[PDB]
Structures are given as C-alpha cells and as structure tokens.
C-alpha cells in the first residue's frame, strides 16, 4: 500500500502557441499574393505572343501553371492551420490531391528543365540535341505521373478527430495507419527529393564543367544562375526532407524517442514546411525573369 510514484512514465502533452498561428497566416497570405502575381505575369508574357515559342517557354508555362495552382490552394491550408480541418472530408481529399499533384509536377518539371539545359549545352553540336523537341509529350507524361503518384492522398485521406489536437485532414488506413503512412512517405522522398536531386546535380555539374571550359563572354552569368538554382532548390527542399527522415527514424525506434525530441520535431516540421512553400514564389524570378527575353517581353507588353 505504497504510492507508485512517477518515474518519467507520464503522457507527453503537445505544446500549443498562438503567435506561430498569426505568423503562419501572414506568411501564407504573402506567399499566396506573390505567387499569384508572378505566375500570372509569366503566363501573360509567354501567351501574349506566339512568336518564338521555344522548349523553355513550354516548360516555363507548365511550371507556372503548377505553381499557380499550388498558390491557389494555399489559403485553405492556412485556414486549416489556424483552426484545423473543419471543411469536410470531400474538400480534404480534393485539396490534398490538387496540392500534391502540383508539387510533384513542379519538382519533375524542374528536373526536366535541368535535362533540357544539359542537352542544349553539353551536347550542343551532337545529334542528341534534336531529341529535346518532344516538350509537349514529356510534359503530358510528367503530369500523368504526378496524377498517378498523388492517388494515395485521394484514396486514404479523411477528417480525423483526435482528443489532444483539433481535427486534421489526415490519413485513415486502418488500425495500422502509422506504418502505412510511413511506407507511403517513401514516394515523396524518392520521386520528390532523391531522384530529382540526383538528376539536377548530374546535369548541372556537367553543364558547369562544359561552361567553365568555353571561351564565351556570358559563361559567368550562366554559371551563377545555375548555382543559384541549385542552392535555391536545396534550401527549399532539403530541410523538410531531413526533418521527415528524422521523424521516420524516431517512430521506428532507430533513434531514441522522448517528449522533448517530439516537440522539437513538430516545430521543425512546421518551420520547414513554411520555408519550402516559398518555391511557388521564387520560381518565376529564378527561372523566368532572370532572362533577357522575358524582361524585354514584360517591358513591351506594358506599352
């Protein structure tokens, strides 16, 4: 008849804050507005004149559409972050499908642009360069692959009502949902980070190697642009994937699990999601408006 006492076997209760909520709302609204304006301007510049529509123009059009759809979906995500998912199951499914489809499409389009530049520079004089005039079919295939890879979100998502937390547009795959979610996370980290990252690194490394050996007067600017693109992609996507892998390891008990680490991982996940959302706004500047053609077009249109 002795009190059992407490020896760290206590429920780990999550910590809630409201400043982060207001900051998240402001950041999401700013990102929404910037992405909308930039993507609309890119689309208008490309579509105003049908003269000189090259492969890069098609790629940029597809990328702009993807980013515009992502930004258009953002506001409901911001509201959900504010007060959890109150909008119902059907909207959860549809919005998640749109968001993930556009995310996959954007990443794969960046990879395709990298391959296009590799072919256009490294193999400029060879006969392989002629194989880059299949932009329409390649873009259609990328969109189809994104739609295929986004199916699990559509099929296995609904509204989950928990006790410690507000309702969430989560996945409900049964009593064993955690393991299936961990497995399904393999697709975003393989066809979303690792494969595009390797393709981009290979292509841009060889492109830089060829450029450094040339004697043109414009080598420096192209090299700086390539470095900026690669660093932007890394800064945007590496932290989120690193934190996701850390969470996956923590759940599997490969790394020790404690309340402090869980709270830190949640905070890092939120911060890294906010950080990675900036790609929809930074793509138009990095890929489209850093070129003379688009700037001249923008100047001409305003006449």
């Amino acid at each position: 008849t002795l009190p059992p006492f407490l020896l760290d076997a206590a429920p780990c209760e999550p910590e809630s804050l409201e400043i982060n909520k207001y900051f998240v709302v402001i950041i999401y609204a700013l990102v929404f507005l910037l992405s909308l304006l930039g993507n609309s301007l890119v689309m208008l510049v490309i579509l105003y004149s049908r003269v000189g529509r090259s492969v890069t123009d098609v790629y940029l059009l597809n990328l702009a559409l993807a980013d515009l759809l992502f930004a258009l979906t953002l506001p409901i995500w911001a509201a959900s972050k504010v007060n959890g998912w109150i909008f119902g199951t059907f909207l959860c499914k549809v919005v998640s499908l749109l968001k993930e489809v556009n995310f996959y499409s954007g990443i794969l389009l960046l990879a395709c642009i990298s391959v296009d530049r590799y072919l256009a520079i490294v193999h400029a004089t060879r006969t392989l360069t002629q194989k880059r005039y299949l932009v329409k079919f390649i873009c259609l295939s990328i969109w189809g692959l994104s739609l295929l890879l986004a199916l699990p979100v559509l099929l296995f998502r609904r509204t989950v009502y928990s006790s410690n937390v507000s309702p969430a547009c989560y996945e409900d795959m049964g009593n064993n949902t955690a393991n299936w979610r961990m497995l399904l996370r393999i697709l975003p980290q393989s066809f979303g980070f690792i494969v595009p990252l390797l393709i981009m690194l290979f292509c841009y490394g060889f492109t830089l190697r060829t450029l450094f050996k040339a004697h043109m007067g414009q080598k420096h600017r192209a090299m700086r642009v390539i470095f900026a693109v690669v660093l932007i992609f890394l800064l945007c996507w590496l932290p989120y994937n690193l934190v996701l892998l850390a969470d996956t390891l923590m759940r599997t008990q490969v790394i020790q699990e404690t309340c402090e680490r869980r709270n830190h991982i949640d905070r890092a996940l939120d911060a890294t999601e906010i950080l990675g959302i900036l790609h929809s706004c930074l793509n138009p500047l990095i890929y489209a408006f850093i070129g003379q053609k688009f700037r001249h077009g923008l100047l001409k249109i305003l006449a």
Binding site: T1, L2, P3, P4, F5, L6, L7, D8, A9, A10, P11, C12, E13, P14, E15, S16, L17, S80, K81, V82, N83, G84, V160, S162, S163, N164, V165, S166, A168, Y170, E171, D172, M173, N175, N176, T177, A178, N179, D247, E257, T258, C259, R262, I265, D266, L269, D270, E273
Partner: protein, 73 residues
C-alpha cells in the same frame, strides 16, 4: 487545442510495478486508431500525477475493472 500535421501516441512507455487501485481517481481509455497503433490507458494518481498503464498486461485489466466497479457504486 492546437493543430498538428503528425499524430502521435500519448504514452512513450508504461508503468510496470503493480499497485493497489486505491490510488486511482480518474481514468482515460483511448482506442487504437489512426493516431496510435495500441490502445492507451492513462490514470491519475492520488496526488495528481498521471501514469500510463499497459493495456495488455494482466494486472492492468483487474485494476481498471476494480476502479470502475467501485466508482460506479
């Protein structure tokens, strides 16, 4: 009530030393679901400290049943 994009179990480990039910005042049982793969039993102690019991261990069922029976009276 906050919001999170990762749902986790509420108990990391469980108390293992059997103890008399007289020290229990409040009980909570959470069925397994999307949030956690195992049922969770959390009990308040006499002094206010909270504990996580093992849902499948033998003595836990006895203790929970005795507490509920006594409270129901």
């Amino acid at each position: 009530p906050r919001s999170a994009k990762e749902l986790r179990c509420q108990c990391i480990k469980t108390y293992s030393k059997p103890f008399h039910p007289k020290f229990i005042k409040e009980l909570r049982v959470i069925e397994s679901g999307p949030h956690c793969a195992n049922t969770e039993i959390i009990v308040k102690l006499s002094d206010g400290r909270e504990l996580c019991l093992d849902p499948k261990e033998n003595w836990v069922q006895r203790v929970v049943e005795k507490f509920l029976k006594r409270a129901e009276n």
